[PDB]
Write a protein that binds this ligand. Structure first.
Ligand code: HEM
Length: 154
């Protein structure tokens, strides 16, 4: 699949807003993910002890992790589809070291859309959400293909 320049513009326009507060968006997204799909929390040995949203918000390590994740995702989105090089190491660590099923990538994609919808309604209307979903589907599709080449079905 391929996004048009118009769709990329919608994606990058709302992403520019997210970059005004990467740490904050990172926390909201992971808290949403962990609360909505608690099973994903078990994949993080560093955070699986967190019991409440309050503890999650107060975790300095979780906040730093969120920044690392969103920074990596932002770099991929800014490539506008030409992300082969960026995807290689990400696909290897998540398939081989962390063992993250494609299903879980769908869950975090849902969390990202939910947070952008809540925080940026004016810049995240129907068309913008469709563009973001398409960009994330492309990401998940290419990651899945790499998973297979690497020997991980998940
Ligand atoms: C938007 C998709 C995602 C991106 C861009 C992303 C990115 C990253 C990055 C850059 C790191 C640090 C470097 C590395 O280990 O490769 C990381 C670590 C990790 N990711 Fe992801 N990730 C994504 C989704 C997920 C999901 C859905 C899970 C599982 C629910 C997951 C689990 C992990 C784990 C367990 C680590 C190691 C954390 C640690 O122990 O420090 N990731 N991820």
């Amino acid at each position: 699949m391929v996004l048009s320049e118009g769709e990329w513009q919608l994606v990058l326009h709302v992403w520019a807003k997210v970059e005004a507060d990467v740490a904050g968006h990172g926390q909201d997204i992971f808290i949403r993910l962990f609360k909505s799909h608690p099973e994903t929390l078990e994949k993080f040995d560093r955070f699986k002890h967190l019991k409440t949203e309050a503890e999650m918000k107060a975790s300095e390590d979780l906040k730093k992790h969120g920044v690392t994740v969103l920074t990596a995702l932002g770099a991929i989105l800014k490539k506008k589809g030409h992300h082969e090089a960026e995807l290689k190491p990400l696909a290897q660590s998540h398939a081989t070291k962390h063992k993250i099923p494609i299903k879980y990538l769908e869950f975090i994609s849902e969390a990202i859309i939910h947070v952008l919808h809540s925080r940026h309604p004016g810049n995240f209307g129907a068309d913008a959400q469709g563009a973001m979903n398409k960009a994330l589907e492309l990401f998940r599709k290419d990651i899945a293909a790499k998973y297979k080449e690497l020997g991980y079905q998940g």
